[PDB]
Amino acid sequence: GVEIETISPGDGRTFPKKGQTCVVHYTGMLQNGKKFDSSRDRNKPFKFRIGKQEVIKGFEEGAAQMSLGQRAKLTCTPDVAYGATGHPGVIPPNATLIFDVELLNLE
């Protein structure tokens, strides 16, 4: 369950593919809750690649459904990120995730 609500600008044609490393200024948010993660704070914008199951599955499909310069708005289901177990002390079990994601990559 990946729902994209795109803030427009970018190009919409340079899509991420396999074997590519992409750079994201992500921003976490809990539904009816506060912030829990921000790459904007640490100022190291989280270089990662595609297809190695590094990130969660809900964030993985959202990165492929964007392009260079875009600014999406993720909405993930509990079963794709943590909802059975829950990340200990940081994410409660059966939680719904909200993300502000801007992709400014290379490659």
Swiss-Prot record:
The keyword Cytoplasm applies. It catalyses: [protein]-peptidylproline (omega=180) = [protein]-peptidylproline (omega=0). One of its GO terms (molecular function) is calcium channel inhibitor activity. PROSITE patterns: FKBP_PPIASE. Residues 19-107 form the PPIase FKBP-type domain. Transmembrane segments: none annotated. It is an enzyme of class 5 (isomerase). Inhibited by both FK506 and rapamycin. The keyword Cytoplasm applies. One of its GO terms (biological process) is protein maturation. Its EC number is 5.2.1.8. GO terms for cellular component: calcium channel complex; cytoplasm; membrane; sarcoplasmic reticulum membrane; Z disc. It is found in: Cytoplasm; Sarcoplasmic reticulum. Detected in heart muscle (at protein level). Isoform 1 and isoform 2 are ubiquitous with highest levels in brain and thymus. It comes from the Eukaryota. Keywords: Cytoplasm, Isomerase, Rotamase, Sarcoplasmic reticulum. PANTHER family: PEPTIDYL-PROLYL CIS-TRANS ISOMERASE, PEPTIDYL-PROLYL CIS-TRANS ISOMERASE FKBP1B. Belongs to the FKBP-type PPIase family. FKBP1 subfamily. Has the potential to contribute to the immunosuppressive and toxic effects of FK506 and rapamycin. PPIases accelerate the folding of proteins. It catalyzes the cis-trans isomerization of proline imidic peptide bonds in oligopeptides. Identified in a complex composed of RYR2, FKBP1B, PKA catalytic subunit, PRKAR2A, AKAP6, and the protein phosphatases PP2A and PP1. Interacts directly with RYR2. This is Peptidyl-prolyl cis-trans isomerase FKBP1B. It comes from Homo sapiens. The gene is FKBP1B.
